[PDB]
Design an enzyme around this catalytic site. Structure first.
Site, PDB file in Angstrom:
ATOM      1  N   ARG A  85       0.823  -1.206   0.000  1.00 29.22           N
ATOM      2  CA  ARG A  85       0.000   0.000   0.000  1.00 29.22           C
ATOM      3  C   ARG A  85       0.857   1.257   0.000  1.00 29.22           C
ATOM      4  O   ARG A  85       0.422   2.297  -0.506  1.00 29.22           O
ATOM      5  CB  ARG A  85      -0.991  -0.013   1.159  1.00 29.22           C
ATOM      6  N   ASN A 109      -6.900   8.202   0.675  1.00 29.07           N
ATOM      7  CA  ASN A 109      -6.020   7.633   1.689  1.00 29.07           C
ATOM      8  C   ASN A 109      -4.596   7.497   1.167  1.00 29.07           C
ATOM      9  O   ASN A 109      -4.373   7.417  -0.045  1.00 29.07           O
ATOM     10  CB  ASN A 109      -6.537   6.256   2.118  1.00 29.07           C
ATOM     11  N   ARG A 117     -19.055   4.708  13.380  1.00 31.92           N
ATOM     12  CA  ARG A 117     -18.969   3.275  13.646  1.00 31.92           C
ATOM     13  C   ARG A 117     -18.852   3.011  15.142  1.00 31.92           C
ATOM     14  O   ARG A 117     -19.557   2.156  15.693  1.00 31.92           O
ATOM     15  CB  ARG A 117     -17.780   2.677  12.898  1.00 31.92           C
ATOM     16  N   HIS A 128      -6.183   8.409  10.587  1.00 35.06           N
ATOM     17  CA  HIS A 128      -7.075   7.365  10.099  1.00 35.06           C
ATOM     18  C   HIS A 128      -6.237   6.158   9.695  1.00 35.06           C
ATOM     19  O   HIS A 128      -5.323   6.277   8.871  1.00 35.06           O
ATOM     20  CB  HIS A 128      -7.907   7.860   8.920  1.00 35.06           C
TER      21      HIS A 128
END
Lengths: 313, 308, 308, 313
Positions: free
Chosen positions: B84, B116, B147, B171
């Site tokens: 990533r 992101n 959430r 995050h």
């Protein structure tokens, strides 16, 4: 199938506003009842015209007969006198509430009943006793209105939305009400943190607590005629909407205690969960000794007015 | 000539389309769906235009492949983006390109980033756009907090409206849910522990389910990611700006000393109003919470400084 | 024990998920997302559950792969389904299976069908379910009419709320838009022709763009079909039933003699209320319009009788 | 940036209801103005409390000074007397409207102005002249309210939603109003078709037309005190919302004609498109000879009251 039916016992300024809110939110059929001949029919016709503007087909009816409340899912009561203090209205309003309760029993015993008439906490007990309904289907609107003022005064000072201010008032409606500054939060953040960082002073909060206590009279003196009705109506409909839509909202209302806070068989303002089956849970706060003392004083006033009614047969 | 507010959505994927629909249903303003993919945003905009008829609204929705149609936007919301750390350089280049087009065509816009790694890309975006720091922020804490709030509400069987819960920090896996600040209409969650509504074991689990909530949905869906709650969270921020609501929302915002952080974006509670990020709320975190918050931002500082 | 209304969505694709979100945003009731695909509906339901926190609502949304969780549903909306006559037998079998499960678990539900070919499959569904004909109908005219309405409104530059336009007949290439019945707040569209707001050439084009609107969106999107307006149209029908709104909506409904049709479903204007399809409105169509309506239903009668 | 600002000149029953609708729909800042000291401040405080219940942070202010309307985007006027007929209120209300118009010019000349005070069509002209605003930024609310009653009466008879009933009333507000039964449709379907199929009779429609004409007085006689205000308020806010959100709504309002219907330089009720820039288009119906005769009679009454005002300097 049938639509939800909402009956408003009392078609004055609060009753009319509640009917309009019901129409705008499409909560169900609305019945406006009043002892004044023709007046509710007039407001109901006006309201029906407004449904065209709102693009709904809500049914609003006015009536001077209790039989048109038959089958009501929610009943909201403003009948009585509203103009020494509110507590001295006990004898007059207790007899009106008993008549109302007798008709609820005869015509809509499955209703969720929300009382607004004062002295609120005693009128709730009178209505439950006269109507024979479960204790969890009869309650009083006071704390939501008191808390809405507490929240607004705090929010305006901090310059944040009232949505993000949590504040509660418990106890009896009136000057013995108990605002809870220690429990005030901004999205869960203790208000104490905003004192430290300079958003508000302890003295300002102290004054806000007192302004909440006297907020009802503050509006009466400004208006010149009558009392507040926008916030009272909106507070009662928030309770009614929590019931009709099973929202499980945490709201301070006048409800039946059976041991909580050391109170037995009495209606008093406390935080509760309102849902599809009525008052579904009583939240018992961890009150400090000082707070419990203020709350206990509130209960004694209520218990004394009951006995004052007790010896009045 | 008076004009409706203009909302430009840079990226017309699942979140982008869902955000456009919410703007239409709430009549927040004209909506521009931008994407690099030809015709796809035009087709979604046509579908959405048909939906205004059913909603009895007049909302204007258009799809485009040209950055010049974002001109004059009051709000811009960015979903454009694609081992990533393999994506880091690619997405940094996308953000530079978006920021340069915002600089050219809507320099007075309130800009909300979703791409992101969020806290790094909003940093890159703000730098390329040259806009005031208080007018560029990232959406994440609102999603994470929603959430967190839902999981608590379901265990207690109360409305999510009445649960207050926050997630701060970056995050990602080292986001910092704040169990100590959870309240039920202002009542400390600890009181419900004592009264038997919930156990601390269960709260610990909910903090971790919150941390892994995104991946949990990915595994269930089989293909794709969550987008209903992501879209709703960004629009709550956009509505707070457009209607000057002064909402207290956890968002990725520029810190100039608060929490001991300087020249970096990171999730903190803020007040969003008609002038953007109007106030940074500095929580009185405990040493344990501050350690977790500090850990959260080393990864961000590592990537921002690396990229640079 | 009082209970919230229950809405079951048989099919959790793009329309299914979008419909679930609308039910959540409007607090219409509990939502059950059903699909034959494992876990996918569970994951969408979790995403939607998180969205209730942002919306400050209490809506219950669950995903399932078992038909038994639709029990007690007040409304069921069906998107389940897959050389287009190649699909006819496959989708007819799906509808029989759905209808049998509705018969078993929610026999008192109001059932809205969206699977194509619409007028044929709703016929099959009703037969397999054994429910009253007035409690089973198909969504199409509302979608077609919303496209018809939007195209007119945009040319005249008025709100779609104030354009009245209807499409009757079968859903498909021989759907019948009704130009002669188009009004602007009740004013015949012909008056705007004379006053120069629009030409009849342009109206003719809009009737045909309406006929081909679905394929137009498919070609623009590259992958997939329209779902924002399809979902909104089905929920408008579901809301009219759930709140007894008595809306005049063009829907595929069972005809027992009206328009000269018997024992067949076809798009006609109807009143939807708390008891389902409450009234069939019989328009005073011209010979030309009646010929087009009749042509529309031969293809349906041909497929229904073939299938049988 | 700044929020939209809505000023309500007149804080009576219609004004208060409009302010509450503005609060509930989050249309913008609300200013309640009135000549009665303190009364608007009281309603504004009540309304502010209700924002907590609604989870918004709308700003509502009460005032007795015209300077607090500075910067208003919308102005809605109910000031005047409301209790021979309405037309005889011309001299009293014309002087109140001129004072109001002078203050709009001084404090908020960019406002979209919606008048409700009667005689409506003449008061609109007075306000435009005194304020100096563009003709397209001054209009009167009458037709939306008259049409909302026409729609509701039709919808209740046919038992369909008022949303799906299209009906219009044009001409002057009052007994010379002109309902248009020929243009009534059900989702575009001519009402004539429902006569044929037995949903309604021509006589029933005839009676509905007359009930619309007298609907205002029907409510006054039922209420006993005052006049309708729920539908009037909702109708004015629908106009205001069409402006603030550029909705392009087709609404019958009192607007400036410059040749349409054969009328020059006069405000009269006609169907118009209301959008972000005010009255953006006048729709000129293809009236039949009989309808034009009724409309022309309406205009003459208006033109005569103007001349009656003309010779009153």
């Amino acid at each position: 199938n049938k639509r939800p039916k909402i009956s408003l016992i009392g078609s004055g300024m609060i009753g009319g506003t509640m009917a309009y809110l019901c129409a705008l939110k499409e909560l169900g059929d609305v019945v406006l009842f009043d002892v004044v001949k023709n007046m509710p029919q007039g407001k109901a016709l006006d309201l029906s015209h407004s449904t065209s503007v709102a693009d709904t087909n809500v049914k609003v009816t006015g009536t001077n007969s209790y039989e048109d409340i038959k089958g009501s899912d929610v009943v909201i009561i403003t009948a009585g006198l509203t103009k020494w203090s509110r507590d001295d209205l006990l004898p007059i309003n207790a007899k009106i509430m008993k008549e109302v309760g007798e008709n609820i029993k005869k015509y809509c015993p499955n209703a969720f009943v929300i009382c607004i008439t004062n002295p609120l906490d005693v009128m709730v007990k009178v209505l439950q006793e006269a109507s024979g309904l479960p204790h969890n289907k009869v309650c009083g609107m006071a704390g939501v209105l008191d808390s809405s003022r507490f929240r607004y005064f705090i929010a305006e000072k901090l310059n944040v939305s009232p949505r993000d201010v949590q504040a509660m008032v418990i106890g009896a409606h009136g000057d013995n009400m108990v605002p809870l500054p220690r429990y005030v939060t901004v999205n869960g953040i203790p208000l104490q943190e905003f004192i430290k960082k300079g958003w508000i002073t302890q003295e300002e909060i102290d004054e806000i607590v007192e302004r909440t206590r006297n907020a009802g009279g503050e509006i009466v003196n400004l208006l010149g005629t009558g009392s507040a009705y926008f916030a009272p109506a909106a507070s009662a409909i928030a309770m009614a909407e929590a019931y009709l839509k099973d929202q499980k909202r945490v709201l301070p209302c006048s409800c039946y205690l059976e041991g909580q806070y050391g109170v037995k068989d009495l209606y008093v303002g406390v935080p509760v969960v309102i849902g599809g089956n009525g008052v579904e849970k009583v939240i018992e706060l961890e009150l400090t000794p000082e707070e419990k003392e203020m709350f206990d004083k509130s209960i004694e006033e209520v218990r004394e007015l009951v006995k004052a009614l007790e010896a009045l047969d």
